[PDB]
Design a protein around this ligand. Structure first.
Ligand SMILES: O=C(O)c1cccc2cc[nH]c12
Length: 209
């Protein structure tokens, strides 16, 4: 059973600007998704300081990067706090209406797209490289859900009866045909070293074959 929702107008405008602006420095999407994973991991760690049972759904706090050349997907997995269904619907747990407003004002004043994370809407930088994004998530207080969007003004949410996650978020980037460099080990390693050197959780880059 699949529910289809319209993006709020401002989020549809953000996504269109990300997809249609000429901007070569696309690799920052990975920094932004890793930063979001780090933020989610910090939240479950904080909750666990006063309630150790918060980690009954998984004690390890980590980020995995999983390229798949046959499916043309790059998946970013973390064991952070996850998202409830309500968080997914509410712009993946962001204040994206006010963040988009500020970001578009900053772009008109001379900022560039790489600054998107300063406005709290870095998730949507996935559309620099992905034609479709699927987000699987599990929060301790809710069931496992799949969010998906190919932009175009709408997103879907469904209960996910597939591979159980324990707790956390998996962002599956269905890459554009001309963006397959982000499946190459040496390219991913270079981006993680350049932009994510101070992330305080283990980042494991899986290899293929
Ligand atoms: O239920 C599934 O479709 C499924 C797919 C891939 C991996 C796993 C692990 C448990 N269940 C899975």
């Amino acid at each position: 059973e699949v529910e289809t929702f319209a993006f709020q107008a401002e989020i549809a405008q953000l996504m269109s600007l990300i997809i249609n602006t000429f901007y070569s420095n696309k690799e920052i999407f990975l920094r932004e998704l890793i930063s979001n994973s780090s933020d989610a991991l910090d939240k479950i760690r904080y909750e666990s300081l006063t309630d150790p049972s918060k980690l009954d759904s998984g004690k390890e706090l980590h980020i995995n990067l999983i390229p798949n050349k046959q499916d043309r997907t790059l998946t970013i997995v973390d064991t952070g706090i996850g998202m409830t269904k309500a968080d997914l619907i509410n712009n993946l747990g962001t204040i994206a209406k006010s963040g988009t407003k500020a970001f578009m004002e900053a772009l008109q004043a001379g900022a560039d797209i790489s600054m998107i994370g300063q406005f709290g809407v870095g998730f949507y930088s996935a559309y620099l490289v992905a034609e479709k994004v699927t987000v699987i998530t599990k929060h301790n207080d809710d069931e496992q859900y799949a969010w998906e969007s190919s932009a175009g003004g709408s997103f879907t949410v469904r209960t996910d009866t597939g591979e159980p996650m324990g707790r956390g978020t998996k962002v599956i980037l269905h890459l554009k045909e001309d963006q397959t460099e982000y499946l190459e080990e040496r390219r991913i390693k270079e981006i993680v070293k350049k932009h994510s050197q101070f992330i305080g959780y283990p980042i494991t880059l899986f290899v293929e074959k």
